Amino acid sequence: RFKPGVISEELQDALGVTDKSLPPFIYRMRQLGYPPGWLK
Amino acid sequence: EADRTLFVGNLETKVTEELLFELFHQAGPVIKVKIPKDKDGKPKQFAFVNFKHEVSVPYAMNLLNGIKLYGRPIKIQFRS
Ligand SMILES: [Br-]
Ligand SMILES: [Br-]
Ligand SMILES: [Br-]
Ligand SMILES: [Br-]
Ligand SMILES: [Cl-]
Ligand SMILES: [Sm+3]
Ligand SMILES: [Sm+3]
Ligand SMILES: [Sm+3]
C-alpha cells in the first residue's frame, strides 16, 4: 500500500529533512490532492 | 510512450537512479529511472523517469519541480 511521505534515511538527508520534520514535497501534496497514480 | 516520461535535470553529482526512483515514487508508481552515460561511461547530470500512468506526469511536475536534492533544485521538463 502507498504511504505518502514515508521515505528512507538516504532520501531524508538528500532532501535536507531533519528528524520529525515533514518532507518538503508533502506541503505540496496536501494541496494538490492524493497522487492520482496511487488512487485505489 | 513519451506520454509517461519526464526529464529531470540539474542533478547534484550524488543523485542516483535509486534516489530518484524513491522520490518520484511519491508522485505515482514508477517503472524505471535512467541516468544516461556518455561514450566514455560517465553519468550525465539529468535523468528520465518512466511512470506507469500518464496521469502521474503532470502531477509529478507540480509535486517535485524545484525540490532540492543535496542542495540543488531539480529541473523537471515534459517530454511530450
Ligand atoms: Br499527507
Ligand atoms: Br545511478
Ligand atoms: Br541522452
Ligand atoms: Br527529452
Ligand atoms: Cl545508470
Ligand atoms: Sm500510452
Ligand atoms: Sm495522452
Ligand atoms: Sm541502495
Numbering used by the authors:
A (entry chain B): 285 to 324
B (entry chain A): 7 to 86
Q: Can I see the authors' text?
A:
In the nucleoplasm, however, hMTR4 binds the RBM7 and ZCCHC8 proteins, forming the metazoan-specific nuclear exosome targeting (NEXT) complex. NEXT promotes the exosomal degradation of non-coding promoter-upstream transcripts, enhancer RNAs28 and 3′-extended products of histone- and small nuclear RNA transcription. We conclude that ZCCHC8 is a scaffolding subunit that bridges the interaction between RBM7 and hMTR4. In this work, we have shown that RBM7RRM binds a proline-rich segment of ZCCHC8 at the back helical surface and is able to concomitantly bind RNA.
To obtain experimental phases, we co-crystallized the complex in the presence of heavy-atom compounds. Co-crystallization with Samarium chloride yielded a different crystal form diffracting to 2.0 Å resolution and containing a single copy of the complex in the asymmetric unit. The structure was solved by single anomalous dispersion at the Samarium edge and refined to 2.0 Å resolution with Rfree of 22.6%, R-factor of 20.2% and good stereochemistry. As the two structures are very similar, we focused on the highest-resolution atomic model, which includes residues 286–324 of ZCCH8 and residues 7–86 of RBM7. Side-chain electron density was well resolved throughout the RBM7RRM–ZCCHC8Pro interface. In the complex, RBM7RRM exposes the front β-sheet surface to solvent and engages the helical back surface in binding ZCCHC8Pro with conserved interactions. Overall, ZCCHC8Pro adopts an unusual elliptical conformation when bound to RBM7. The RBM7RRM–ZCCHC8Pro interaction is dominated by conserved hydrophobic contacts that can be grouped into two adjacent patches. The first interaction hotspot (patch 1) is in the lower half of the RRM domain: ZCCHC8Pro helix αA together with the preceding and following loops insert a set of apolar residues into a shallow hydrophobic pocket formed between the α1 and β4add elements of RBM7RRM.
